[PDB]
């Protein structure tokens, strides 16, 4: 059965799409705001050097703010999380905001040489940008592995900002109050995306991929968890708290 988009489905599909589109600069302009990049020579790939200069680390961290407040600006957009309690939606934002940013970032993401692409040679972000911002390939190899896998799904708009919507309005994050009806919201969300694979998207693909993109929330949990093991080490750093946020210091702290 391939039941037709209702018109609740359609509406939520447009907000979601006019929501992304509000807080997603596709071409990256802001940039140039923040700190800038700097890479220092580190062909060796030196944890003692990294982590003495993390010479990255001013610059991602203020693209990773700058993306906090998007996707904070992108939530507060999806229907139904207003009806929430603003302590459950503090406590759904500060659990899924490293994982939407992994998420938003698939759009910057290209095969061609397995890089963030935001502009010219200073705004292309390589796994080496990433090590010497204080990460190890323990995150590294999954995040590319990751990006690649989402990549191949070629998701349309619409899936996927329903992905990254069903991201952050999980009844499953330690600490949610109302569990019950952060499942009925996004329940909502997975029978409209469930629905438009269903009738929108061509094979091959009509169906399986559902399954794929549930996994890949799963995967996503995975990645959380490692990032925030190496935030930790990074915290560790003399100094490293000046090379963040106040908003990402409360985020991942
Ligand atoms: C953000 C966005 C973009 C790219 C994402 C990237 C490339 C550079 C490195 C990132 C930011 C990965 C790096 C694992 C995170 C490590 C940094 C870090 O622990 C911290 N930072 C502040 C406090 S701790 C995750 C997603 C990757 C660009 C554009 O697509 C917008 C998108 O939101």
Sequence with gaps: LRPKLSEEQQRIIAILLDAHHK???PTYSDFCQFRPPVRVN?????????????????????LVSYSIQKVIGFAKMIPGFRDLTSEDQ???????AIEVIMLRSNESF???????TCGNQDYKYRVSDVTKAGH???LIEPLIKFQVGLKKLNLHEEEHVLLMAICIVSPDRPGVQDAALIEAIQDRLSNTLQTYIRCRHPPPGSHLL??????????????????????????FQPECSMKLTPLVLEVFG
Excluded: F
């Design 136 to 138: 190890s390939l323990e």
């Design 110 to 116: 290209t095969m061609d040489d397995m890089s963030w």
């Design 90 to 96: 503090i406590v759904l934002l500060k659990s899924s």
């Design 42 to 62: 580190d062909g060796g790939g030196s944890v003692t050097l990294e982590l003495s200069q993390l010479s990255m680390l001013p610059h991602l961290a203020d």
């Design 23 to 25: 807080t997603y600069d």
């Design 210 to 235: 559902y399954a794929k993109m549930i996994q890949k929330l799963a995967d996503l949990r995975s990645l959380n968890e490692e990032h925030s093991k190496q935030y930790r080490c990074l915290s």
